[PDB]
């Protein structure tokens, strides 16, 4: 049977391929169709019956099954700047992801509460991986979730006013019937079987 997934974009790109590798590896010839996007768009997709499973970010309201999956944390990245305080004075441009989720407002709030000022809006982008690439090309600094980071060329954790890392969840949503279907069960399996680490 054919598994129809809706995955948030950064998840689709960075976390899911190891998941799908093992899923393909123990279930040869099993079909997978994958749509990606903003959590909001994939939630809306899931709701309207287009997919079996949604892998959504944030805190989606959902009246079916919802599995917490994981949590990651916000990092400021730049090629030059090594000290997060420096960004208050920086003239290096700020490369901001903005969508309809809370991501953007969370960062605006952290910034307002950390530096007692507004961040300069210069570069606005609508997808997170683009912000990452533009940061990796030295254009400016970005704030990315650690699920999108590796041994790439400076990463500085965001901590709130009480020294706590911020702060973002990934869930697995779906209605009951989907979890009745088998390949969904083998996929949820592979996920929870993988996460054993």
Residue ranges that bind its own copies, judged by CB under 8 A: 9, 12-14, 16-18, 20-21, 24, 28-36, 91, 93, 121-127, 129-130, 133-134, 136-140
Binding track over 91-110 against Na ion, x by CB under 5 A:
-----xx-xxx---------
Residue 189's CB is within 10 A of a number of other CB atoms, namely 14
Residue 74 in the binding site for Na ion (CB under 5 A): no
CA-wise closest residue to 38 among 103, 96, 101 = 101
Residue 133 in the binding site for Na ion (CB under 5 A): no
Please, which residue, 57 or 113, has the CB nearer to its own copies? 57
According to CB under 5 A, which one of 36, 39, 170, 183 is a site residue for Na ion? 39
Least distance (Å) between residue 82 CB and Na ion: 12
Least distance (Å) between residue 166 CB and Na ion: 12
3-class secondary structure for the chain? CCEEEEEEHHHHHHHHHHHHHHHHHHCCCCCEEEEEECHHHHHHHHHCCCCCEEEEECCCCCCCEEEEEEEEEEEEECCCCCCHHHHHHCCCCEEEECCCCCHHHHHHHHHHHHHCCCCCCCEEECCHHHHHHHHHCCCCEEEEEHHHCCCCCCEEECECCCCCECEEEEEEEECHHHHHCHHHHHHHHHHHHHCCC
Residue 79 in the binding site for Na ion (CB under 5 A): yes
Least distance (Å) between residue 22 CB and its own copies: 9
Which partner in Na ion, its own copies, none is near 159 (CB below 5 to 8 A by kind)?
none
Strand-strand pairing, 94-97 and 123-125 = parallel
Please, which residue, 9 or 176, has the CB nearer to its own copies? 9
Please, which residue, 47 or 66, has the CB nearer to its own copies? 47
Which partner in Na ion, its own copies, none is near 31 (CB below 5 to 8 A by kind)?
its own copies
Binding site for Na ion (CB under 5 A): 38-40, 78-79, 96-97, 99-101, 135, 138, 143
């Amino acid at each position: 049977g054919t598994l129809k997934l809706a995955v948030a974009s950064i998840i689709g790109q960075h976390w899911l391929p190891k998941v799908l590798k093992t899923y393909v590896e123990r279930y040869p010839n099993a079909k997978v169709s994958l749509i990606t996007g903003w959590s909001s768009e994939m939630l809306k997709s899931l709701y309207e019956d287009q997919v079996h499973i949604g892998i959504i970010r944030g805190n989606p309201e959902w009246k079916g099954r919802k599995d917490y999956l994981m949590t990651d944390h916000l990092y400021l990245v730049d090629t030059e700047i090594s000290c997060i305080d420096d960004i208050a004075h920086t003239d290096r441009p700020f490369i901001q992801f903005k969508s309809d989720s809370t991501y953007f407002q969370e960062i605006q709030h952290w910034w307002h509460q950390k530096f007692k000022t507004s961040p300069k809006q210069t570069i606005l982008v609508d997808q997170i991986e683009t912000c990452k690439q533009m940061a990796l090309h030295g254009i400016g600094y970005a704030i990315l979730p650690s699920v999108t980071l590796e041994e790439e060329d400076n990463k500085m954790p965001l901590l709130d006013t009480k020294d706590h890392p911020i702060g973002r969840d990934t869930w697995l949503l779906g209605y009951e019937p989907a979890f009745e279907l088998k390949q969904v069960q083998a996929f949820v399996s592979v996920i929870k079987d993988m996460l054993k680490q």
